[PDB]
Structure formats: structure tokens, C-alpha cells
Amino acid sequence: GVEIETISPGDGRTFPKKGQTCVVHYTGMLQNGKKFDSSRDRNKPFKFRIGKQEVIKGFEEGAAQMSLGQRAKLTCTPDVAYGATGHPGVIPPNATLIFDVELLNLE
């Protein structure tokens, strides 16, 4: 279950075309308030192509719902993202995730 709440407005018409890389900035944190990753800390825009299973399926679906130049807070159901066993030492098992993604560029 993904809930794409809009942190800020972004051009509604633009939407991620299928089979295209999406340049994003994301700051993922746990439900209780612990922050585990921040793309801004890496100082590089994370790149991923839609239609592949490289990223979490919930994250890809939320990015598909997202629009260019628009930031949103979206929550990923633990069953979707690392349900049975989480990423070792990063996400505990059966724990929900919260993201904050900006779709700066699509090229």
C-alpha cells in the first residue's frame, strides 16, 4: 500500500514514461523517526530505470505515480519492501518505510 501525499506541487502533466531512467533525490527514514539513508548526503542524484526490478517495486510504483518537479512523502508496506527478512543491519524485519523523493530530471 503506497500513499503518495504531495510535500510540494510539481507539474501534473509530466509523468514517468515507461522504460526510462528517472533521476531522483530521496531521503528514506523509518516509521519511528530513525533516518537510515539520504541521497543528498551522497551528493549524487540516484538513477534508476522504470520497468525493472532493481529498486523496490513499491518505490518504482510511487515514482510512477509521482510527477516531474514534484516532491512527495510516500510510505511502503513492509510486505512490499523487505518483508520476510530486511536488508541486514539496515531495515529490521516486518518494518514500514517512509521516503521523500524529488523527480528533478528525466533524461
Binding site: 501525499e5 504531495t6 510535500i7 523517526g33 533516518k35
Partner: protein, 48 residues
């Protein structure tokens, strides 16, 4: 970047730039004595 608008008490609200409470950077909405919101969501008692 952080920007809150709201009101506060004269005694309970004591911002000390530093650790504060929770994750740090406590603003007007973080203090339970004070009341304020930032854009989409309101802030009371350091919870959104």
C-alpha cells in the same frame, strides 16, 4: 530547510540552539508549550 509559523508562551518556550529534543533543531512546533505549523502539517508536542 525548516520554516514554521505559529505562536508560543513567554515562559515554556525556551529555544536553545543545539541539541534540543528529538532529532534536534527544535522550532516553535516542537515545544508543547508553543503551537505552530509548517506548510502541509501542524506541529504540536514535537510530533507532526
Amino acid at each position: 530547510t525548516h520554516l514554521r509559523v505559529g505562536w508560543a508562551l513567554t515562559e515554556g518556550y525556551s529555544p536553545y540552539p543545539g541539541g534540543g529534543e528529538g532529532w534536534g533543531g527544535n522550532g516553535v512546533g516542537d515545544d508543547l508549550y508553543s503551537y505552530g505549523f509548517d506548510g502541509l502539517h501542524l506541529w504540536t508536542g514535537h510530533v507532526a
